[PDB]
């Protein structure tokens, strides 16, 4: 990273960051098979299997009601997701997805809209119910001497119960993708199937947490014993393009006593989203992972190419650079990725110091740029900032 100090505007541009920008959404439809648990009955009273089977049936009914509510209610991210979900809810699409996964647990499906989604099947609970539990419950007796059966029921219905709980606690649209909606291996498989080049897929597989964080899930519905839902994952199609951070402080001069202060109002993150310069005002909109900067394409603001020139000549006429003016100098510290801007004016004693030897140097009045190699701490009166 290279941090350049602009004396004209008492600012800093830090450059060298490599971008990672979202360019779309990939839909992974999931079909979780529960089996014919609603044709099983335990009439022998309290048992572990009975409690587990009651939890399972109650969950299936709760998810049916939640889907009813969601569909009675649904009559940019969640907008597109709900659109593609209404597309999938068509009977043709549901049958086509359940047939595509007739002999495989993963397939590439194509909807009527041309949308290319990934269909996945979670068949563990159906397999347990049809190939084991149904034979164990003979003549409506579930207080059997096989405790491994109850343990297995718990193990194989944990995920179904968790999915139902998360979709019911959020009315059909979860804000986050849990490990029960989509595991880590399923997430990697979804990433590998995204419509983007190899480099983006490699970068995203190496940063799966960032992908999961920006994703959500939408319940499609309960079709028989099959709970169908969908996970929308971010597709980062633009990578390794320039990003830079601008940080500023009040630049004040004096003329015959009258002060003139200027402060850049364009501070924040900037990234070259493929021919469009995008500005993120709040630094919480971007996160730094090593050399890469993940910025949320939402909350971004397109700015003209000419705005960049504010870092070369703040007084340019080719663009109205965003600045604020004043006549009352304010002393301030603006920490930059590799240092700090220090505006020191009358009535303030500013200094730079170290963690081992203490104060290094009193700063002169004006705007100074301190590097994290020159000092470890900056001080304005009694306020102390620690540099990176």
């Amino acid at each position: 990273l290279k941090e350049s100090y602009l004396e004209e505007s008492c600012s800093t541009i830090t450059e060298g960051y490599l971008s990672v920008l979202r360019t779309g959404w990939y839909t992974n439809v999931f079909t979780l098979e529960v089996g014919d648990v609603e044709n099983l009955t335990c009439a022998d009273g309290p048992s572990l299997i009975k409690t587990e089977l009651d939890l399972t049936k109650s969950a299936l009914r709760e998810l049916r009601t939640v889907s009813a509510d969601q569909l009675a209610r649904e009559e940019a991210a969640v907008t597109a997701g709900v659109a593609i979900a209404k597309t999938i809810r068509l009977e043709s699409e549901v049958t086509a997805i359940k047939n595509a996964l007739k002999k495989t647990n993963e397939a590439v499906s194509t909807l009527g809209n041309g949308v290319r989604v990934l269909a996945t099947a979670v068949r563990e609970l159906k397999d347990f119910v049809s190939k084991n539990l149904t034979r164990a419950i003979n003549k409506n007796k579930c207080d059997i001497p096989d405790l491994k059966m109850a343990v297995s029921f718990s193990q194989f219905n944990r995920r179904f119960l968790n999915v139902v709980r998360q979709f019911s606690d959020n009315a059909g649209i979860t804000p986050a993708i849990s490990l029960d909606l989509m595991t880590d291996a399923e997430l990697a498989r979804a990433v590998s199937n995204m419509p983007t080049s190899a480099g983006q897929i490699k970068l995203m597989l190496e940063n799966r947490a960032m992908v999961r964080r920006k994703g959500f899930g939408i319940l499609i519905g309960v079709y028989g014993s099959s709970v169908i839902y969908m996970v929308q994952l971010p597709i980062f199609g633009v990578i390794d393009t320039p990003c830079w951070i601008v940080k500023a402080a009040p630049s004040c001069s004096e003329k015959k006593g009258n002060y003139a202060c200027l402060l850049r109002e364009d501070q924040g993150w900037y990234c070259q989203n493929a021919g469009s310069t995008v500005y993120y005002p709040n630094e919480k909109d971007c996160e730094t992972r090593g050399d890469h900067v993940f910025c949320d394409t939402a909350a971004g603001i397109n700015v003209a190419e000419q705005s960049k020139e504010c870092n070369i000549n703040i007084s340019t006429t080719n663009y109205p650079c965003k600045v604020s003016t004043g006549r009352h100098p304010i002393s301030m510290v603006a920490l930059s990725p590799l240092g700090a801007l220090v505006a020191c004016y009358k009535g303030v004693s500013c200094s730079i110091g170290s963690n081992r030897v203490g104060i290094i140097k009193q700063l002169n009045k004006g705007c100074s740029y301190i590097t994290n190699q020159d000092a470890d701490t900056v001080t304005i009166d009694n306020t102390v900032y620690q540099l990176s």
Partner: nanobody, 123 residues
């Protein structure tokens, strides 16, 4: 949060001038004026920040308008001279309870908003 009370609008003719006022129910740091015109989107007109004691205007308005503040009354005044048909809009007063710095030129950085005041230029 703070509630903002605006005033001063009107129906004025090309070339004439108006003055708008906006007072706050509490302490404000960044206080300014945006404007949304019929059919267009909300745009920045001018703001003052007290943390940095600085003032900014948009390019469309610089030279015509002027913004001033009374810190004791948490009040902000906006003089609007040489008003032309293209300044016809609903001007909203915006404010920020205070704290961290952030650009004045962007509405997302303001958390308090008024209902608006009409300014109509014609004939």
């Amino acid at each position: 949060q703070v509630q903002l009370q605006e005033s001063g609008g009107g129906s004025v003719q090309p070339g004439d001038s108006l003055r708008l006022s906006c007072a706050a129910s509490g302490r404000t740091n960044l206080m300014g004026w945006f404007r949304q015109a019929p059919g267009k989107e909300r745009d920045f007109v001018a703001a003052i920040r007290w943390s940095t004691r600085t003032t900014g205007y948009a390019d469309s308005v610089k030279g015509r308008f002027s913004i001033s503040r009374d810190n004791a009354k948490n009040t902000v005044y906006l003089q609007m001279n040489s008003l032309q048909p293209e300044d016809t809009a609903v001007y909203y007063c915006a404010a920020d309870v205070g704290g961290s710095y952030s650009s004045m030129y962007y509405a997302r950085n303001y958390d308090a908003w008024g209902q608006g005041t009409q300014v109509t230029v014609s004939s």
